[PDB]
Structures are given as C-alpha cells and as structure tokens.
Design a protein around this nucleic acid. Sequence first.
DNA 1: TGTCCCTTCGCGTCTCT
DNA 2: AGAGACGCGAAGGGACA
Length: 493
Amino acid sequence: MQWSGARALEALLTVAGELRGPPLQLDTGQLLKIAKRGGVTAVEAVHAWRNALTGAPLNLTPEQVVAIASHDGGKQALETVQRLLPVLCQAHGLTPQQVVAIASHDGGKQALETVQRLLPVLCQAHGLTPEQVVAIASHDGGKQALETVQALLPVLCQAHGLTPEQVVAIASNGGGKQALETVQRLLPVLCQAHGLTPQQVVAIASNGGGKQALETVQRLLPVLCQAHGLTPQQVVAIASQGGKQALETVQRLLPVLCQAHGLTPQQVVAIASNNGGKQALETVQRLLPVLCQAHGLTPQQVVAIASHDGGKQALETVQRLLPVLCQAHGLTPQQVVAIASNNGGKQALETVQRLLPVLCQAHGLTPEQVVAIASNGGGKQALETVQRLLPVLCQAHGLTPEQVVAIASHDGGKQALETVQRLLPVLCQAHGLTPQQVVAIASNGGGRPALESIVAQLSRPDPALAALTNDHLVALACLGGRPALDAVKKLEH
DNA sequence: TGTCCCTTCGCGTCTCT
DNA sequence: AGAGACGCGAAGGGACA
C-alpha cells in the first residue's frame, strides 16, 4: 500500500481475504467501498469485530455494516453502534434502521452520542417527534444540528415567527447548524429590507449550503433585479435549487448567454434553477454552438436538456452519443432529446445505447417502446428492470409485453414492476382482482404506493369499514393512487 | 492518516393540481 | 403529463490532531 507501517500490509491482507469469508460475504466492490471512504482502520475494524455485529443483540446485515463503515470515522461509528444501538432502541423506542441511518454518515459517533444525550429534551421540552430528531441527526454534523436546534428553536419561533416544522426543515440537511444560524441573522434583513416572505427564506435555507445561498442572495438580490431585470421570485427560484454557485454564475454568464448565444432570461433561470446550475450554465455556454450542428438541435431543445439536475452530464452525453444512437440504432433527435430531458439523462442514454439491441432482439420490443420507457426519470432503472422482470412477469404471472411496457413507462417504473411481481398473486387469488385491474393501478406515477395501499386496505380492512366495494377502490387507486386512497380513510374522524 | 464538519453535484421517486 | 417537492448519496474541500 501507500504504507504507514513496514511489513504490516501482510497482516492487513490476511484480514481483507477473511471478510470475503463466512460472517459477511463481501465482494471486492464493497471492500473497495469501505477502504475508499472508510480507511484501513475502518476495514480493520470490520474484521476486528464482525461477529459482534452479525449476531448477538445487534443482528446487523452485511450491507448495513458496509453502510456504517464506508465513511470518515467509520471505525468510531462501528464501535459506537455496538454500545448504543441496544439502549437507543429500548430506552427511546427507535428502530435499528433508524439507528443505522444516523450512523451511516461522517461523524456518526457524534450524532449517535448526541441523539442519546438530547433526544428526550428535544421531544419532551420542545414537542418534537423522534422521527424529526432522527431526520436532523441523519446527516453530516448531526451533533451540530441537534445542538443548534436545541439552542435556537425557541428564538426562531417566538422572535422570528417560524413553525417548528420549518425549523426542522432547515436543520435536516448537511451543515444545518450554519443554515439555522444564518437564518436567524438574516431573516429580518431579508424580509423587511429586501422584501421577501419568510416562507421564501426558509425555502432557500432548506437545502445543503443554505448558509451560502442566503448570504449570496442578500448580496446579489438587488443587482439581479436592477441590472438584469429579474423578478425576486426568479432570484429565489435560483437560490433555492442552484444556491450560491448558480446565483454567482448567473450574474456572470447572463449577459453572455443572451447577447452571444441569444437565450431569453426566462430560459437562463430555467437552466440555473437546479442542482449544479453552475455546471449546466457553463456547459450550455460551450457546447450550445456544437449542439445544433452534426445532428443539430434547436436552442429550445438544448435548454430542455439542461433544465434538470445533472444537466451538464446530459449535455455532454448527448453530444457524445447523439450520432451513434441516431445512426447505428436509428433514432430521431426528437427521441434522444426526450430521453435526455429528465433527471439521469446521461444514465438513460448510456443504458439505452447498450440495452436497445438486447431488448429489441431477445425480448421482441419495438424501439418506440424502449424510448417510452427511457423517456422518464429513472429510465436506466426501468430499462434494467424490464430486462430482468419481463420474462418472469409474462410467464410465472401471466402478463403480456405491452402491459409490462405500460407499467414501466412511468416515473418509478422499476418500483411498479417489482411491486406487481410481489403483489399480483395475493391481489388476484386472495382478493379477487383481475390482472387488467392490477396493471391499470400500476400504470401511473406512484404505482407502487398505489398497489401497496390497496393491499393494506383489503388485507386488514383499515378504518373505512366496507364503505366502498373493491371495484371502486381500484377506480380510485387508478385515479390517484395512494393520495386518493388516503384521502378516503381520512373521511371518518 | 483519521475524524469531523460543510458545500456542491447528480440520480431517482412520488405528488399535486 | 410536467413541475415541484422530497429523499439519498458520492464527491470534494477545509480545519485540526
């Protein structure tokens, strides 16, 4: 290794191989993952006390152990969990999944210890739910957020008039301490002076690097409205999704993108108001010329692609794969744009490229279909899940390709497909639903929760005793999945 | 090298009308 | 049926021992 011993590497690969062995079954991918973000101590620690974690009172799974370990100060968090998980679950009624969630971050030790020490006073004397306290603690520097939340919550509600929900929202991100403090300082300023609603101020603070966004907004808000004729509501749009980098990068690249490349400021806002807005803007500054050419999109389409989380990646991947896709697999740019105009555009294109042949030949789909699957957020996930589950759904469960495509052709296709697999039997035989019904419920966004909800309402006939018959529940569930079904229970208090 | 904290970016799912 | 809200997590940097 890039050693801090002499000859110990020897004693430290004995260990590496044993973790592939009987308690944990670790492939390289994981050992890598641990080493990379955990360190050698992390890897040593896992071996050191692997048996203590898998049985005994903790009964963690390998995948959980990996999750806790693969972080800066993994060793500490592994050692801490051993001590505190039993007490946190018994003395404060948290589930293990919850303790593991807190542990699986940088400085987990500090979060776990701070949760034990402060969970009561937050729940008791500030009327917080433990769910909320876990939310605050489940990030980097939870200790800090927790502590800050204790100190400032009374102030922010009494003085600055905020709900506790709002304060939790702010604290429940990385660097929450900073955001909280920063809001305290700037809330009066930003509201009275710069004319913002406190709701907008929370929006801004309620992301990562919220401190940075707030500060930057106070600084740049007048400039952007005066010198670049933007509305405050647009400046907040940017500050809320893009943060400091985006605001700064907008000021900088707005004149350039409207003189030279000729975009409407309305569109520049659209591009910047996302994660890595900076990256998108800089990428569309370049690459816009060369996009539009050699397989040549209109500016509207470039904007469309860029106006999403990871726009840079989409744009770079489009420019790279647009030819091979259009020519070697015969797709109109119209369709490639569709695929790339969602979160994970890069992932979708790449997955399509590699899976198009497979799906069309081995499973007998038209391209029109494959593109419909890929033209949603999480395309890569749906495509890959179609591949796995198409055979077994058609045979074991007796469905048809067009139907499987219909389920998959929505946001969260993967989930719908998998959930159908789980529930199609129990629903059909045990509750007398027709497969056509089950597919109709699932052929929508939120298809999984729809299905899960509908089961729970029949299996253990929840509050509305018999009110509606099953064909209605299905109708409702297709009409607006879990929301509509939940909105019916909540009509008998 | 390790531990802790903060910021930025990217991918995926559900809801709200 | 498109936008916005929400959740999750990798990556990268700074401060300190």
